[model samples]
Target: SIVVSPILIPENQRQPFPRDVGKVVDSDRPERSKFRLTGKGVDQEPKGIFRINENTGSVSVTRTLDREVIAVYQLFVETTDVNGKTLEGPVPLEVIVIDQNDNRP
Candidate 1:
């Protein structure tokens, strides 16, 4: 199952988003996972943003992010085995950065 948290960050400061998702299975298979980020201002194709630990099933970001480009982002996770076999299921995450009233006229 997927578990995503709400966006929380002050608008003015850079958005340092953090979220987690997991996959649990009884079978003893090596975990291989990948994540894709999407949203209203995101690309249609899944953008690889995070990678999940094979043994722990812990999802984490793999690339550097800039909140200035995007204030909010929706992410999805997919996990599989070494032989292209699915281990668990896909999960969703919501990334949000609070808006700061910092606009100089």
Candidate 2:
């Protein structure tokens, strides 16, 4: 089972789109072989908010975030072989949106 640390981001901090947030790696994969990583259950409800790089397994954001709207994003991470074969089960991943001074009046 592969695990990723919790990702923390500042709300509405403008920098770049599709910024790398977290990564997923296959521990049980064959040595020197290629594999794929995916993020499930994130794009359906939120539309284009999140994307996972198929090759690098890096989770990214499409737009700025608002902590007041959604404090946290929950998703599942899974790994697959390059031939589209399953390598691991769906693992829970967390992305926390932190508040900023913009919240003050």
Candidate 3:
């Protein structure tokens, strides 16, 4: 399971960040699963922004980010067997990144 969301903040603040947006899941497999997040209008190769717990099906953002880009991110999840065969789906995570108040023109 994976959860993500734009950091939510107060509306009248100078800097409104994003909060957890949503979640995704591949399957109920005992083994560890892997997920990849990508999409249009997003930063190139964003690393360590998201994480997955091997023991549990919980996925979440590991850091706080200032929302300055409007984007639609695609998340893909896959479950594999010990033989490296895919056993689950490459689920799509639709992330709608919104702009912060600081982005005012």
Candidate 4:
């Protein structure tokens, strides 16, 4: 079982930095060890835009999302065990950057 819903983020939502995107929790954890979550696109190409709480699975967007560049961000969320080893994923997660007319008429 996995998450079927895509995260929706409006382009330049007129707010502060480091906006909250969403959370990725491993609710199946029953052991004492914790999980670490990370992403690709947001964490790479457009680095400094998305950040994940390695210990809490909380995902945040550092910069405003500009849909003009890319409408959809194909991100892969991966997790690791306490010893820094793949435990769950590199699962595909979709981040939809809603469009807005920022250009002047």
Candidate 4 residue pairs in backbone clash: none
lDDT of each: 0.44, 0.63, 0.42, 0.63
List candidate 3 segments past 4 Å from native: 1-23, 26-44, 98-105
TM-score of 4: 0.75
For each candidate in turn, the TM-score is 0.41, 0.74, 0.47, 0.75
Candidate 2 collision pairs: none
Give Cα distance to truth, residue 89, candidate 2, Å. Answer: 2.2
Over 1-105, each residue of candidate 4 has an lDDT whose tens digit, in order, gives 123256777777665777658876665643433444344446667666666666666667777777766676766665666777767777777777875564311
Q: Which rank order by TM-score, best down to worst?
A: 4, 2, 3, 1
- Decreasing lDDT order of the candidates: 2, 4, 1, 3
Model 1 worst lDDT window (10 residues): 37-46
User: Residue-wise lDDT of candidate 1 within 1-105, one digit each (tens)?
Assistant: 334455443334322533333332324334354333343323332255444444454544434444665555564444565665555545555555454574211
Error of 4 at 20 (Å): 1.8
**Model 4 residue 15 lDDT?**
55
Q: Candidate 2 versus the native: TM-score?
A: 0.74
Report RMSD for candidate 3. Answer: 6.0
Q: What lDDT, from 0 to 1, does candidate 1 have?
A: 0.44
